């Protein structure tokens, strides 16, 4: 099924925000599903996610089993509704809101999912530990094998 | 299926940390499933989660489809593998680790899931906004209805 993410990036540091600013619109719609879309728009839609961000970042909207993972850079947007384990993401807050929203030329009562990103995870950060950044944990010894090489049969 | 959460709470401001400290153990094991358990232990078990926290808070471990929601207070622990949507949580990410650990008193190569929480969401905070807390969002007007009241068939 289709997910609509309305990126609010007021500072315009992401491609999304620059798309939107240059079209004099507050949001950049990212539509993921059978039909894909990137479009600056004036308001979110019913059931839309508003992803308020301060700039570039890896952001994961975790809405139960609805997981949307997004890379927002100054130069591009990449997104998926499917698992994306290779990368780290900031897990953002999802808070439902009762709103009134303009939908197909008419004011309608609608739920919106408010998602506030803090920008604490840089885009395209690999989701494992290099030999240096490996956390020291009591009763946890070193392994010879990499994570990949350990998953076997 | 069963989940094993090993809380590492070194400052011992959570019940978990206090108890681990009192019993001279680094972790507090929380086992969710058919069999439940609360127990101070020396080390995490294979396929286990290390939840490193700095103090009390709402923590949600996000491991794809597996989501573990935990309230760690100074006076209690509460946890679940199912949706817990009345409350806010800090979305905590999983970074898998290739390790060696004691399992049944024996040293084995094992995957552990490392999870670091920052302690920025307090336990038992409603996942909704009072009207004074709502974000000012362009093209987003206020509703007369509640979130709960807007859901209505």
UniProtKB/Swiss-Prot annotation, chains A, B:
Superkingdom in the source lineage: Viruses
Protein family per UniProt: Belongs to the orbivirus non-structural protein NS2 family.
Function, in words: Single-stranded RNA-binding protein.
Name of the protein: Non-structural protein NS2
Organism from which the protein derives: Bluetongue virus 10 (isolate USA) (BTV 10)
Lineage start: Viruses, Riboviria, Orthornavirae, Duplornaviricota, Resentoviricetes
Gene: Segment-8
